[PDB]
Structure 1
Amino acid sequence: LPDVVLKPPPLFPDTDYKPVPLKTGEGEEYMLALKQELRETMKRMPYFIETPEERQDIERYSKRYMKVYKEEWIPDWRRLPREMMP
């Protein structure tokens, strides 16, 4: 008959097989660097819309100095339907 267990099995049981190490070479490193560059450059892209901040505490003279300025891309309204114009 099967024996009784006093404590539950470990949350992460150990395994004798480990993951195969990653492939090495200039190609993999270049792809990694390019993916990191894409991560870094695609957040500042106008397509990356951020959450509109709201509930400003007060208005100040330094506003014009701290006013975030960023160019906005103009969608082609010819291809896009009319329901998306502001």
Structure 2
Amino acid sequence: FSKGEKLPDVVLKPPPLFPDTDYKPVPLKTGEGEEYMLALKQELRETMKRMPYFIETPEERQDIERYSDWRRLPREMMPRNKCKKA
């Protein structure tokens, strides 16, 4: 009867908690790159597209997308600075 009242608690609150957003200063550098590459990995060639949308669409028609200085000089050096195995 001592516990026969309700679900123990909606949540259990721990009197001690997390410290902070630890290592605060320097992960501004990594933290933007977290969002930088994710902006570029999604907009990459190495991804797949929902061709199941286009086989789902029987409404295909014209006028819609569904229907539609490197300044450098030559050189050649091939180094074996790396392993000679496998």
TM-score w.r.t. the length of structure 1 is 0.20
Q: Which has the larger radius of gyration?
A: 2
The CA deviation at 1:35 is 0.5
**1:53-82 deviations in whole A, cap 9, x for unaligned?**
9999999999xxxxxxxxxxxxx9999999
- Which residue is 1:14 aligned to? 20
CA distance in 2, matches of 1:53, 1:14: 53
In structure 1, which of residues 26, 37, 41 is the aligned counterpart of residue 43 of structure 2?
Answer: 37
The CA deviation at 1:9 is 3.2
CA distance in 1, matches of 2:74, 2:57: 24
Q: Residues 80 and 25 of structure 1: is their aligned pair in 2 closer, same or farther, counting only changes over 3 Å?
A: closer
**1:22-81 deviations in whole A, cap 9, x for unaligned?**
43899998744320214994242689999999999999999xxxxxxxxxxxxx999999
1:1-86 alignment, distance < 5 Å: 8-14=14-20, 17-18=23-24, 20-23=26-29, 31-38=37-44, 41-44=47-50
Number of equivalent positions: 73
CA distance in 2, matches of 1:81, 1:17: 44
Q: CA RMSD in A?
A: 15.2
Structure ranking higher on relative contact order (CA contacts 8 Å, 6+ apart): 1
Q: Residues 28 and 59 of structure 1: is their aligned pair in 2 closer, same or farther, counting only changes over 3 Å?
A: closer
Q: Residues 58 and 9 of structure 1: is their aligned pair in 2 closer, same or farther, counting only changes over 3 Å?
A: same
The CA deviation at 1:21 is 3.2
